[PDB]
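Entry, Tuesday afternoon. Goal for today is a structural model of the target with zinc ion bound, before we commit to ordering more compound. Inputs were pasted exactly as handed over by J.K., no edits. I checked the ligand SMILES twice against the vendor sheet because last time a stereocentre got dropped in transcription.
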Amino acid sequence: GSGKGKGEKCTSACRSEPCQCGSKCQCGEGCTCAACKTCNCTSDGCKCGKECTGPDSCKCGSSCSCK
Ligand SMILES: [Zn+2]
Ligand SMILES: [Zn+2]
Ligand SMILES: [Zn+2]
Ligand SMILES: [Zn+2]
Ligand SMILES: [Zn+2]
Ligand SMILES: [Zn+2]
């Protein structure tokens, strides 16, 4: 409809509300979506080992164990 086109690397699922990217995460790296692009590392202990210990301090991509 609306004549527009940006670099949407993310899938329709990710671009939905709420995000439907799930754990499969078929979107693109660079969205930092707070649903799929999350981190399971806690401040108590890093779950992946990248020492990110939190999504807000995450430095590794979505193909990581904390994702
Ligand atoms: Zn998403
Ligand atoms: Zn995603
Ligand atoms: Zn995305
Ligand atoms: Zn992480
Ligand atoms: Zn980690
Ligand atoms: Zn990680």
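Residues 10-58 form one domain.
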